[PDB]
Design a protein around this ligand. Sequence first.
Ligand SMILES: Nc1ncnc2c1ncn2[C@@H]1O[C@H](COP(=O)(O)OP(=O)(O)O)[C@@H](O)[C@H]1O
Lengths: 133, 397, 1178
Amino acid sequence: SIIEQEYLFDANEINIKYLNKYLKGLQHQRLERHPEYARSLYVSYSRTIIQALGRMNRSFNKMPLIRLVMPVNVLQMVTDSGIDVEKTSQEYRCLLTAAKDWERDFEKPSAEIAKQNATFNTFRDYRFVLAYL
Amino acid sequence: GMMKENEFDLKNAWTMLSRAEYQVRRAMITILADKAHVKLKNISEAGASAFKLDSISKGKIREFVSKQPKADSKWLNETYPTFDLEKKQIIILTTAKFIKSYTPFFEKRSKAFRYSPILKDALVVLDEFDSTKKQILESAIDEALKIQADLNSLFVDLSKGLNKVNEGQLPAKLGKSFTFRDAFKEILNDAEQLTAEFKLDFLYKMEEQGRDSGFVMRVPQTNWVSVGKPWNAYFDEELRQVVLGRQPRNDLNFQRMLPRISVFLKGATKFILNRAREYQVSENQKLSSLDDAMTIEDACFSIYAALGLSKSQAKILFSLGHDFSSPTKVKTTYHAHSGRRFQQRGLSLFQFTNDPQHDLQTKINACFFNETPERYLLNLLSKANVLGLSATATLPT
Amino acid sequence: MQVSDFSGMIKKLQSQSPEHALMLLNAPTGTGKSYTIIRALCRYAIKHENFRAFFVTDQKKNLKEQDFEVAWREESGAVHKAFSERVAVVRSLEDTVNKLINDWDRQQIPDLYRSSPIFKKSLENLGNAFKSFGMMKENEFDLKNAWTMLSRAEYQVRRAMITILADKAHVKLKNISEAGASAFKLDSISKGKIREFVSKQPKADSKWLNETYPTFDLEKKQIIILTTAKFIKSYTPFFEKRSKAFRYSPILKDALVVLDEFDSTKKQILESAIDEALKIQADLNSLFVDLSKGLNKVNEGQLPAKLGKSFTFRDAFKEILNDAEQLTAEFKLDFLYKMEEQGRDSGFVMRVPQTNWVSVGKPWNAYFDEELRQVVLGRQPRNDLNFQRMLPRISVFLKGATKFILNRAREYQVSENQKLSSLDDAMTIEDACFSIYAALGLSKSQAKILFSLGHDFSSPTKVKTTYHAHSGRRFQQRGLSLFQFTNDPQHDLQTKINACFFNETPERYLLNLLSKANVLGLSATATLPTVLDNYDLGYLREMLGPRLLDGVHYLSDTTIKEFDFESRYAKQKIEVKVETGIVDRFFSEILPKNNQKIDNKKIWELDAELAKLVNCIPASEQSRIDKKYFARRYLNLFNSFVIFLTDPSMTSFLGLQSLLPGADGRMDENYIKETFTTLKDLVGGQDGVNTELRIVSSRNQEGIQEQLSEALNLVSQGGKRVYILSAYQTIGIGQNLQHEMNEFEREQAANIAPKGVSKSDRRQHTIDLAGMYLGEVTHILSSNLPFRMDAAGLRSIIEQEYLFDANEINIKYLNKYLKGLQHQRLERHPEYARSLYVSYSRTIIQALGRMNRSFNKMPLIRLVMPVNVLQMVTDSGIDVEKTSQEYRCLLTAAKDWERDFEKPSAEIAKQNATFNTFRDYRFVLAYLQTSKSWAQIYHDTRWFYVRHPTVSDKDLKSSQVFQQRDDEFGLQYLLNEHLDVSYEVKPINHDNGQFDFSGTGMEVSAEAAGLVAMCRYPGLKEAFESLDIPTKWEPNERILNPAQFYNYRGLLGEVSGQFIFQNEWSLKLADFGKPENYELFDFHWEGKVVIDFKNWRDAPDVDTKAERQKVEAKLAKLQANTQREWRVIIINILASNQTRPVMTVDGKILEISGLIDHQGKFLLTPEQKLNVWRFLNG
DNA sequence: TATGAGTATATCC
DNA sequence: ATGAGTATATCC
DNA sequence: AAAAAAAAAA
DNA sequence: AAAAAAAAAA
Ligand SMILES: Nc1ncnc2c1ncn2[C@@H]1O[C@H](COP(=O)(O)OP(=O)(O)O)[C@@H](O)[C@H]1O
């Protein structure tokens, strides 16, 4: 758990505020909700979905009509952010066109979180360097 | 198979199975040795536990199986690929097996793939890159939890060993390589200053009335206490102890003591790793037949044992960084830089334990996690080419 | 046997509360020892609330817990307590698991734990674990892992029960259950509430809980029944996971420990010690260095003052620190010892109280290489560090320092236990020792090995015990050690010296137990004088004194009279006949000599068959390719077969052997069975049909007692008398050998019942056996050829040490045995070791005791046995007038072949005493250089030698040097059997202390004394009379051995020589006041003269070269010592002829070879006086 | 160069 | 002291 | 103020 | 002559 949160922090997907809230929740056994705009969560969900949909693309003969059945949560969780959909299976592209009603914007919150994390890291570096100097 | 439910019994069941398999291997070894006229017992030991054969005897055995009928050799080579691991051009194995060790034929102790000479200049094809990372990560976590040691005693013993190195009380082979570097003098000075500053010569006694102590975490962003109130420590002169507890008095900066000793240990272990690499390179020159060369792990363990450290202390000190010492000023080619603090510092865990059999002090068991899968991959790339294949090899996550 | 007698013994033992005593009872088997001791234990437990007893036995079949239950029911008549909360049966983990799963299968769990699901799943996983554990009972290496899994499963079951009772008692299980989701610890009040809840619980469920888990409340169990294998080990308390050893637990304090088979316990203890010593091995150099660093940390005030104050103020602590610093400087222990690979196996080193020993022959040598900054160890001749000195010196330092730390740990524990309010969780001595060792920065393994060196044996500090414990048995006092050198690529820079110490013999364990609990030992053979199958009763008597009571001084005289049976048998006219089984090369005597043989060539066919069967063995090339002996054994067995066959009156027979018939040609069931079937109808007409044979063994697929019952029943109702073949081991003490009275028995029966017993007693309606065949009992001494550092090798060395202590073997035999082991060769068993024959007689007596457990008996009990057995039975040290009648007549027959022990035992005792004195004085010269107290001991004992050369026992024990040394260091006087004054000895080897007292070559008496050759000198005899040195040796019990006579002669000669030198040359020769000048020289003068005196006789077989090199080394030491350029004078006192001093070519050395002739008058020339005078001043 | 010649029991790690 | 819902692999 | 026993050589 | 990076406070 801790290492996953540290990975999210390193990739500029959660800021020090969310990490502090998560640690405080862990002190009380009151774990917080998953970060809403952490790109890695949705990309991992999409990765599992892509691997699953690749299991029906190992042949040249296909039935004229294909049916992909899933709950709404799968539609809400998949995304195309850094995923080259052009070189992905047609099934996943159709799934994305179906799930377009819930597409998120990750570039903005990632940008502000990157700024906040860079500032926090600089401040920690200077807090160390004074005490060592 | 029966004991596969509980993971505590898994270790013991695995050990028993390993012993049985080793006995089978020994039987096969005797059968092949008599067919090749090799004096096993003489090579091994007239007694029991031994079978330390020379290169020539096992070479004769390999020659005999090479000239053996095809079915026999095929079965032997399929069942025991490690019978002649140098001849194998392609080695197919799981990620979990790749991380861990392989047991050589003719031997009882297993050798890790990580430090084996079999990887030098090899090509590693990870067919499930990126699915491997989680596996590696999981293994890393498990290993981190297996290796724990009392931080105070570990630091004191390492400082004592380094001071022995300073006074020329170790063989000249490594002593003359330790002493001529200014980093050695600086390490000794830091050890002395830290011992004086945190009163580490004395016993840390943490009085509990029975309440759970939780643990303390150190992550690159902050410290963390699982039970709220920070731990404080002062030097009780009348008791000649270091009182550790929840009292407001903090004359020693315990929350500063915990990471400072860890940083010192990490740096000192890196220095010792460099010296052990030099020692291994020098020693492998003496060897004529480069078939029983010593690995970097063996050199590090030998250095730690010569310094007077225990086997567990050697394991925990060596795991603070596994043979990762970088290239050579990249020969002024490319500057490897990164702002990711967790990849560079990892994290640490500390738990305080009181036992009636060490009633006079409190043990500060430490647990360091430094080798993330990315660092493992970089370290692997320090000695082998890697080819990663999947349909999702470059998904940003 | 009256119960009141055992009650009297119990109350006498309890009367000895502060200084606990040991009581041994000798009562023949078949009498009510176990029964009446159980009754008396139950009665005393009921009457007295605080009485606690441990009924410790050796085999699980002898617990007699049902007998305890019956006795408890009978003795209790008012409260009739439930017997489960007062009497406990502590069983093994495996037995507890077996009981648990049997209760699960048979619904024996009182439906309070069965209903809960967690308890269920614990039971299924525990059953699975037990199935796997039983599946893996073949190998012992993996037995540890299976035991660990079983222990974990059982602990899970216990935790389930704990939480069930917690929720049923409203106790804050949460405190634990949250803060302890693994460790699961509780506090005293919660477990007290649980205990008081289960106290008021219904009878059935609390009864089951107390029966299956005696450790639920151990401080309430008055009687604890267990096996000695469990008694030595630990018990796992309820509400806890870490097991606690019985040895250090407070439950033994002031308890009474009843050992139901006293002599059989020692063996069980000995191996339990041996394999323990091998489990605890540590690197010697690292161990010493770490202990030294910890002690130095204590000195610098870095340990908490709580123990720093206890450590620092003692002088012994400063002495320890100085000794450790000197040892580190001397042996270069700060540096790494590296041994280059030997190619071949390096073997191991062993040290025993008599010598060092190397399994490879070539000695190990070590020197400091300065260029390498290392210590090189190997077979090279260069030995500058004295490795053979290094190992014992470090081991001795470790032993002493650990004893000091153990004393400090006792103080720490007694101080810490006072602060605690609850006495149910105080720390034991082991916890204190481990805490102190961990405080000095020592690893858990290092702490374990350091603690295992003396454990918690301390002895009473008070000097008013009114009895001085003393013993000259070196093995009991210093044990033995083993060292193995190992190299490994993981520690490539250094060679590990793994050390293994054996210091706790079973006698020392018993003495340690007697320091905190009374011991009552019961056995039919509790006091047999053997040191191999019984405790060293001599050592125990020496170390106990009045604390070693005898149980017979409390039995009713009626029972003592009843013990004898030789009058009972004559009243009923019972005859016991025994004859020798004479056998030679071929079967010419197993056939009946009576001229009624039908087939002649069939005998040749049988001979050819046995020759073929003994020639089909490829074991060894000696002993006629291992064929000659086996044939003789077979023919003796078949002679027994024939003798049983011819007689129709023999209702049953038990031909006990030392082998189980197996596959190999040694003993095979098929050949014996076919031979018996042939001889059945080969001799006699009714003999073949009436006689039968049936073999009972563990090689079959069924138990032993039940098949014996089957055979006895076949005799009882099948009408056919049977021959039963067994081994001495497969049927031991505690096994029954009686059957119902068949008609043939009914019409030929008799009774020897005592007075006061009805006709329906258990022993009244059973009958005894008709005669046994006694084959050669073997293996008393181990004979494992591949002598390695394992349990068998330690057992062999320990048996030899035991023999050497009890004065049964001498130094030459031990040296020969060790050299044989060095060459993988065994030596002949000692021919006059009393312990061998007493153990042989012991196993025969134990076998014969199984036919005397019943009243009804049949007459004409004929005995048959091999001739070799008749050669090895003895009555020495055995109460022949109180043992079984069968053994009595066996000794009567043996009277022709009995051998003497007194003379060889006395000779070996003299040799061993002299050897021990020589070794003691050899150690004194090594250590005298450092300290000065040991100088005081040496001076005091050396003067005690001449104060009164012939001493009585009472005078010697009540002395000043014998009283404080706690052993017989240098005071091993001989025993004058004829109260004589003089004796002659032949010295085999002077520099090894080997003497033969049946030889000639050196007489010791007043010839070397004042009254001759020196008394007549004026001013010399008067000084001796003033110095209380009598010139006449009074005829009393003890006299000085040759090693002590050497010091006696040397002291007299040195005093006389100093006096005459001072008289002749008129100066006061000052004494060496320098502590460094020990062993340097006798006396000094004017800063450049050193004077040495000797009392040697006329010219011995010694060359001048030895004296020259001795004085050369001595003067090198002297110049290195006093920083001058000394010149030496040496003196020989007596000379029959004119022998003038001989000077060196340069005049460096002065050597006078005679001053006073054998009359006491001066002989030296006045010109030579002038020569010595002007040489003395230069 | 040189001998003596088993089976069995029980418990923790 | 709620958010969120696992199977695969292998040495000590 | 209760720590012990250490030589060589075969 | 290739050791690291160490605030409090929550
Ligand atoms: N006083 C007695 N009352 C009842 N039985 C006795 C008595 N004395 C001996 N026996 C019986 O003789 C046998 C052996 O005696 P026991 O009391 O067990 O002591 P041991 O085992 O030392 O001979 C047992 O079967 C026992 O029942």
